């Protein structure tokens, strides 16, 4: 009988708490409405720089630390003089120095969610002038072209030091004394071995806190490079809306899909959750085997070396 | 004359509609947020300056807590 | 992570 | 009876419809705000713009390229006749048609020239686009670009005091010997410039040999820890530097860059002179500010054409 | 410069 009381009682806990959040969210469709111009505007004008190319060059950061190159910064390395030179950032302090940065993370600045080329050629800022000293001694997020990599790794057996530190300070790395990025012909295929390290061999050993069919399909080794227009994912779905790169924001060696997601979306604070992501997948600067599919660390660089 | 509980059970089953609908709303902007905010940082290197804002998921993911109690009316 |  | 009025307390009929409205707008609005981003991301698809840039043409030396086109005193990859890796040089073209090339410059005290041997060879510091930027291209590179097939080069010790007036000083078939012999510089004769010839020694009084011991012409290159000078030790280190020492010097450029110039026997680490001197212009205590040094082909010194 |  009584139900005719939902009118002025049961209902009076809806519209009030409906028109409310449809509104307290309305005043969101605002902030997240202008800012998209309050920063789209201050975009009208690009950012400039001036990387005074130091005197000392080399074939790559290794030969340079062997030519007096001791301060870590913007260098000009020239692998096989059968290809146009190019700037880069060297690491000449952390571990014998001479590490040629290949990718770097420490802020947003550079979106990695691009297509083929940008990944093949190279995108980002290969460091920027150190507010005072006329040279670019501090690294800036970027992804030194693929070719350049697929090539610098071709200088015989090439080491690779993927390091990282998480927001609460802690830090670990993962060295792959055996790393090679195949030619853009084998869809940049990635071969890696001799994994030493404390970060957890998430590229070879696959993601740990999982199992078989679930683990192994988080194997980055043997993997092709894939983008959101270059589908070579380990995931084989006859559907175009489903792809390990269209999701998991940013190209990378995807094997249905990842255990490590460098070049991912940039998540502030580390922890993030599906109810945030463009597609609900764990797309972010993630290294599952260490912090978990839901911790998107602060900085994560991939700097390599010959020998 | 009928005492119709019709224009009730109905004009109340609607609440249930635009209740599930909004839950998507309050979640389309809990992502449009995150996507917008992250895509903004996506310029501090392709654009000059950038603004240092916030987002708060203690509020965005708070409005959700209530819109998740307001369930049960039959 | 992996997929279903 | 009366409560049949419910068709009155039934106002939600539209007290709700005004939501199935404001709602229907937001999402709809989003189809718009989902372009108001699709376009911004693309506006943020490039890198910061960089000033420094490498030009297209390249050849023998700055002078070769500076005569294949050119006109912009900039940086070009040069690969000397009998050379190797086309390292980068900081040229300087005029209006005539002659392309110079520094090999050492000083302007502020931003490159602590006091690097060890293997650094003075491969050079250290940093080039740049314009010019202002202390740098030592490095004797190594200074060699292959001073003996390509052997055609007369020359140094023009350009300078400037801590008071405006700049000098300059030239030399013949300038040439820095291969690391083998060391880096012993070999110029034939002095050729002008009121800069004062301090490579021809200078008598400081202390002893009649102040002049023979502080002559730099044909004096192997000494580093703080690899000195082939004519001393009973390393002048370089004794003064902390890497010049072309003897027993010891007069005309210290790779030396202690001083704020102001004129220094004293107090800052002198070990005591003697080590600043930016040139006895044939200023004394051993007065250091300079500006202080380049640049090669160039000789058959273009008094070209007229 | 000049030494003994
Ligand atoms: C992985 O697949 C599903 C993921 O939801 C899970 O139910 C299953 O137990 C897992 N299989 C193994 C053995 O890893
Ligand atoms: Ca596929
Ligand atoms: Ca000696």
Layout of secondary structure:
The complex is a heteropentamer, with 1 copy of chain A (307 residues), 1 copy of chain B (74 residues), 2 copies of chain C (4 residues) and 1 copy of chain D (305 residues).
Chain B: H1 6-9, H2 13-28, H3 32-41, H4 60-66
Chain C: no helix or strand
Chain D: H1 12-15, H2 22-33, H3 40-43, E1 49-50, H4 62-65, E2 75-77, E3 88-93, E4 99-104, H5 117-121, E5 124-125, E6 135-136, H6 139-144, H7 210-213, H8 235-239, E7 293-295
Antiparallel strand pairs in D: 2-3, 3-4, 4-7, 5-6
Summarize the structure in words:
The complex is a heteropentamer, with one copy of chain A (307 residues), one copy of chain B (74 residues), two copies of chain C (4 residues) and one copy of chain D (305 residues). Chain A has seven helices and 14 strands. With 307 residues, chain A is of the alpha+beta class. Chain A folds into three domains: 1-51, Single alpha-helices involved in coiled-coils or other helix-helix interfaces, CATH 1.20.5; 52-199 and 299-307, Gamma Fibrinogen, Chain A, domain 1, CATH 3.90.215; 200-298, Gamma-fibrinogen Carboxyl Terminal Fragment, domain 2. The longest helix of chain A is centred in the middle third of the chain and has 7 residues, at 146-152. Chain B starts with 5 loop residues before the first helix and ends in an 8-residue tail after the last helix. Chain B has helices at 6-9, 13-28, 32-41, 60-66. With 74 residues, chain B is mostly helical. A four-stranded antiparallel sheet of chain D has the order 2-3-4-7. Classes of the chains: A alpha+beta (307), B mainly alpha (74), C little secondary structure (4), D little secondary structure (305). Chains in contact: A-B, A-C, A-D, B-D, D-E. At the A-D interface, β1, β5 and β7 of A face α2, α3, β1, β5 and β6 of D. β1 of chain A pairs parallel with β1 of chain D. Chain D: Residues 53-299 form the Fibrinogen C-terminal domain. Chain D: Heterohexamer; disulfide linked. Contains 2 sets of 3 non-identical chains (alpha, beta and gamma). The 2 heterotrimers are in head to head conformation with the N-termini in a small central domain. Chain D: It is found in: Secreted. Chain D: Its main location: secreted.
Chain pair sharing the greatest interface: A-D, 48 and 53 residues
CATH superfamily of the largest domain in chain D: Gamma Fibrinogen, chain A, domain 1
| Portion in beta strands of chain D | 5-15%
How many β-strand stretches of chain C?
0
Query: Class of the largest domain in chain D in CATH?
Result: Alpha Beta
Cross-sheet strand order for the largest sheet of chain D: 2-3-4-7
Assembly type of the chains comes to heteropentamer
Anisotropy-based shape of chain C: rod-shaped
- Please summarize the sheet with the most strands of chain D: 4 strands, antiparallel
Number of helices of chain C: 0
Return the structural class of chain D: little secondary structure
> What is the radius of gyration of chain C?
4 Å
CATH topology of the largest domain in chain D: Gamma Fibrinogen, Chain A, domain 1
Residue share in β-strands of chain C: under 5%
User: What gyration radius of chain D follows from the Cα positions, in whole Å?
Assistant: 32 Å
Tell me the number of helical segments of chain D per DSSP (H or I, 4 or more residues long). 8
Organism (chain A): Homo sapiens (Human)
Protein name (chain A): Fibrinogen beta chain
Coiled coil (chain A): 1-42
Domain Fibrinogen C-terminal (chain A): 52-307
